[PDB]
Design a protein around this nucleic acid. Sequence first.
RNA 1: GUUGGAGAGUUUGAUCCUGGCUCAGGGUGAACGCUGGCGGCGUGCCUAAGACAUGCAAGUCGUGCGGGCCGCGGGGUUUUACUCCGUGGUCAGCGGCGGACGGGUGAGUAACGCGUGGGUGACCUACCCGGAAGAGGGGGACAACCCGGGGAAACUCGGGCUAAUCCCCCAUGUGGACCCGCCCCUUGGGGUGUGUCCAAAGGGCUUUGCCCGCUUCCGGAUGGGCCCGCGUCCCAUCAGCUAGUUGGUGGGGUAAUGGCCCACCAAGGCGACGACGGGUAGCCGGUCUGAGAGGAUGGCCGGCCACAGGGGCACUGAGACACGGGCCCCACUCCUACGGGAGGCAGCAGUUAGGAAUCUUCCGCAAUGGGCGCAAGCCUGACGGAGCGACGCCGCUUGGAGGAAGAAGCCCUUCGGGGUGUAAACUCCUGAACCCGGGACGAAACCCCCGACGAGGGGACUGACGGUACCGGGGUAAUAGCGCCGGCCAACUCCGUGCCAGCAGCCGCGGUAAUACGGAGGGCGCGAGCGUUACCCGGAUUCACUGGGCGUAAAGGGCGUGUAGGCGGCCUGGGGCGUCCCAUGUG
Lengths: 208, 99, 104, 85
Amino acid sequence: GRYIGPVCRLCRREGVKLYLKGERCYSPKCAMERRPYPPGQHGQKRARRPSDYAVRLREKQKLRRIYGISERQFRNLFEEASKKKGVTGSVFLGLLESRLDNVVYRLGFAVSRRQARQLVRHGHITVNGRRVDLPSYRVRPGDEIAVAEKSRNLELIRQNLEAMKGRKVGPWLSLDVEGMKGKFLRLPDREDLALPVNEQLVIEFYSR
Amino acid sequence: RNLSALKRHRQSLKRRLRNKAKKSAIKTLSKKAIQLAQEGKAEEALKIMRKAESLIDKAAKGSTLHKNAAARRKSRLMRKVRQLLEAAGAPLIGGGLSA
Amino acid sequence: PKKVLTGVVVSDKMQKTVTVLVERQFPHPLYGKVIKRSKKYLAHDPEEKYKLGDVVEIIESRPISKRKRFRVLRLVESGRMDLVEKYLIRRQNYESLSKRGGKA
Amino acid sequence: MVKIRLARFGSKHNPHYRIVVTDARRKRDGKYIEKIGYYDPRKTTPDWLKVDVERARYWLSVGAQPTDTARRLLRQAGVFRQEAR
RNA sequence: GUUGGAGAGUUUGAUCCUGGCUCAGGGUGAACGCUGGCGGCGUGCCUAAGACAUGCAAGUCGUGCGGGCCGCGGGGUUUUACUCCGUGGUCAGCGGCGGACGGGUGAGUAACGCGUGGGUGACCUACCCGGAAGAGGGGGACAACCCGGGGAAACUCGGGCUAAUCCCCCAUGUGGACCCGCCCCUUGGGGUGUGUCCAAAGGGCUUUGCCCGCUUCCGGAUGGGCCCGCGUCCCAUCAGCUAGUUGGUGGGGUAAUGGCCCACCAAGGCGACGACGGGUAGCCGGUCUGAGAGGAUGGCCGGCCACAGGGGCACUGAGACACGGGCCCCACUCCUACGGGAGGCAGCAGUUAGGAAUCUUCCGCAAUGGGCGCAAGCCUGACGGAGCGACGCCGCUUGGAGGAAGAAGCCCUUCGGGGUGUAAACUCCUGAACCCGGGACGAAACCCCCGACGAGGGGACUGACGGUACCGGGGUAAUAGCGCCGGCCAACUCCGUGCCAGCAGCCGCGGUAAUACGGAGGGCGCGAGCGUUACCCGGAUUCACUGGGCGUAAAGGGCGUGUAGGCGGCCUGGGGCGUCCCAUGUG
Ligand SMILES: [Mg+2]
Ligand SMILES: [Mg+2]
Ligand SMILES: [Mg+2]
Ligand SMILES: [Mg+2]
Ligand SMILES: [Mg+2]
Ligand SMILES: [Mg+2]
Ligand SMILES: [Mg+2]
Ligand SMILES: [Mg+2]
Ligand SMILES: [Mg+2]
Ligand SMILES: [Mg+2]
Ligand SMILES: [Mg+2]
Ligand SMILES: [Mg+2]
Ligand SMILES: [Mg+2]
Ligand SMILES: [Mg+2]
Ligand SMILES: [Mg+2]
Ligand SMILES: [Mg+2]
Ligand SMILES: [Mg+2]
Ligand SMILES: [Mg+2]
Ligand SMILES: [Mg+2]
Ligand SMILES: [Mg+2]
Ligand SMILES: [Mg+2]
Ligand SMILES: [Mg+2]
Ligand SMILES: [Mg+2]
Ligand SMILES: [Mg+2]
Ligand SMILES: [Mg+2]
Ligand SMILES: [Mg+2]
Ligand SMILES: [Mg+2]
Ligand SMILES: [Mg+2]
Ligand SMILES: [Mg+2]
Ligand SMILES: [Mg+2]
Ligand SMILES: [Mg+2]
Ligand SMILES: [Mg+2]
Ligand SMILES: [Mg+2]
Ligand SMILES: [Mg+2]
Ligand SMILES: [Mg+2]
Ligand SMILES: [Mg+2]
Ligand SMILES: [Mg+2]
Ligand SMILES: [Mg+2]
Ligand SMILES: [Zn+2]
């Protein structure tokens, strides 16, 4: 299935915050905040040089975890941007944002990505006016990501549809706060997304 | 046993025994045309030739010889009799023969 | 286009028949230098006209015997023994390279 | 004889049919001599049926026999229509 | 958008080069182990072309025709016997069309078998389409049925009746065939002149005309035989093979050319540019690998081939030399009265065998396809679906939001403390499964009336998946498992053990401080899969066209001569074979 387990420990594995714990992950709690060093018995001891391949892999893992999809199809998404006409680093992401489970988490309707998924899986979501239980979902420019009326008066929807009067979307996006709607303007750029990944280093792991 | 099948082999038998009668008539008859052709009896050979040539064609309407294969046996005979009568005497009838 | 072939007769020693040597040039499948490889076509010459060493064209045709599938079109040149010697030199040399032997 | 019929090119529960000209005894979905259109019987599109009339109108001056199904799909294509007075 | 190319480990006290073995990457018709919740779509005897029980797998037309039987209804007699017409249940037969298509398996073949492209003036072609014409007259058979004989059986023998689109003679012959003649073309192609020969069959109904048929002829299309050009694995530790062998004239045979086959005559044919023998394998579209060039491979789907227990053979027919047709021998199995006969799944499904491994004796002919029929219809183990198998790819759940300066227990500790770890406990939220109801598309044809039998229009029939998918409502917190952690290779410590026990792909670890063995805690990678074994490619510029080398590293023949073959100087011109270019047909 999906990975399911001790999430804020990769808040610390690759050494920087991955906001996957979600609304806690802006505390002086999310695990990183306390103890930067990554897991078990040794995590505090002196860390030596990382192999050329170490680093090659770290920065791949980060981007795989951070987006909350498992390897086997993190691949067919890479290998589907390769097969596509344009910059490979920049196409890749481009079809991470078009996935449904992170079409929500940037459209507001959730606290973290792992949560944001549940709402997709469970019949809660509208796509060009229909119900989609499919995180694997290719959201195109002009699509309509909303909520089905039935779930609307749920707290989790709403405390989150709240806070959005203090934030903004992401410039490829209109949020319709009140009407509970959302619109996919275009794809992103590598202009926008300021992730803590370096993407060529990802591709240099999918060269070997 | 499968009575769709058996039917067609009993069938076979009956046509083989009409196809035997057909051919093994024509051999016989046309051999007795070659024969009268040798010693110049242009009268009689040219008779036998036509009662050969027809028993040909009527085995050609049927499924014994083909039009291609029956036409064949017409040229075997017709020519070879027109030619045995070379080494003898001129065609009396001119039945199955074009001068 | 019942194929047309230019080759030089190398065998008279048969009846209404004759052997012809046609050759072709081409880049080697892989290695790709021009090579030149040839083959001999048992042609049909009825009236017997063409002789031992002539330069002829042949065309694909109604099968005449077992290995006769070419009639002879026309003559491009007569007298060209140069190759008939060469072809016989090759045919000769088989006398050598045997594990019967070759004497001095 | 020469015939015109239907040949499968979908999968389980998802048939998409092809219009074909092919020799009677030939295997169903086999080396046909001419594709003259498709027919979507699950009809999931605006274009769930194309034919092109002018070929089936050579192909019957030809003398290629339709099915029932395929016959009905040609009348409905316009294939068999007449005009003037 | 030149879209595309990662290497390390190991010879030595060490260093540079050669060079092999080795690992990392992707790949399957997979199996094996620990583990295994689901669905969609694929897919599943790779081994014995070993042997198969039972059922089905090709038949259909009563509008080609005559009866059996078992009834049912109506007629000639006042009543019986018996006989007359139709009709229903039905069963073989006579006849037509089909059985050669579909399906299966690669045993066989190194071959015109397959791929590519051409010849066929050397050819056939059923049902379908168009065009030209014609069905007049006479005769007889074989079944079915009846009566009789052989036989354990298989079934086989005998004489009699009879019809028909079954068989035959006569005529007309628009046309066609053959012989000979001329005239174009030029391998047997097209015309024309005389002689010669051949046609047919009737059933049905909306009966004085429409339908399914019938016969001879040119043509369309379709499919197909046959022939050639190039392509088509290895070993020369196989170098010489050939007597129907190569060619000639006559002949037979076929739809057709031809040693194909026969007779007779000349002595040829082939081969190092691999003849011959031996070994192996169906070939291809494509499939996997790879930067490319190549290397590997041809299950499924599709195109061509070849077989139907082994082998030879012909009949019927347009077609085969025929899987569920036929004649003969052999092996094997089986019935037997010891004369004799039966039998063929590599068609679906299963059994047995073998083997590391490969499944249901399922539903339905609704769809689609084929046979037959005027039609309703009929057969359809093709096929459409379901079942079983994580075998494979993809889609999906096992929660999520909050939560301690951070519980217990478990491990390390330098005894201060570090780690599992916000993970758990509880707080809140959502609701796979399940429950209730509704509930498909896939299917409009053939048919029927209108209308002309046409174009067009109207009505009717029908769902094996399935009470599935999907929509409305309800609702529980709700499977985790494998490999690894010295280097290459992401991951570090305590004990136990002490060259023992053991790991291992390579070098290697273990002889009381083991990051290597077995456990624990901790860690990395993956997730309904994770590993191991086998094979294909990459790595491997370690077969080197791209892209290599010989002084010592594996390697220059011990030296010449010279044949095949490979290669070649300067000046101009003709050819255009190569090579370039454009249009076109094919792929
Ligand atoms: Mg629901
Ligand atoms: Mg015959
Ligand atoms: Mg050393
Ligand atoms: Mg690679
Ligand atoms: Mg693997
Ligand atoms: Mg088990
Ligand atoms: Mg097998
Ligand atoms: Mg009756
Ligand atoms: Mg077949
Ligand atoms: Mg061989
Ligand atoms: Mg009798
Ligand atoms: Mg007559
Ligand atoms: Mg008749
Ligand atoms: Mg009659
Ligand atoms: Mg083999
Ligand atoms: Mg390479
Ligand atoms: Mg191969
Ligand atoms: Mg296949
Ligand atoms: Mg068998
Ligand atoms: Mg046999
Ligand atoms: Mg069988
Ligand atoms: Mg049908
Ligand atoms: Mg499954
Ligand atoms: Mg398993
Ligand atoms: Mg998956
Ligand atoms: Mg939680
Ligand atoms: Mg409908
Ligand atoms: Mg390491
Ligand atoms: Mg181990
Ligand atoms: Mg120790
Ligand atoms: Mg250990
Ligand atoms: Mg190589
Ligand atoms: Mg070298
Ligand atoms: Mg040396
Ligand atoms: Mg030496
Ligand atoms: Mg020169
Ligand atoms: Mg010059
Ligand atoms: Mg040129
Ligand atoms: Zn976090």
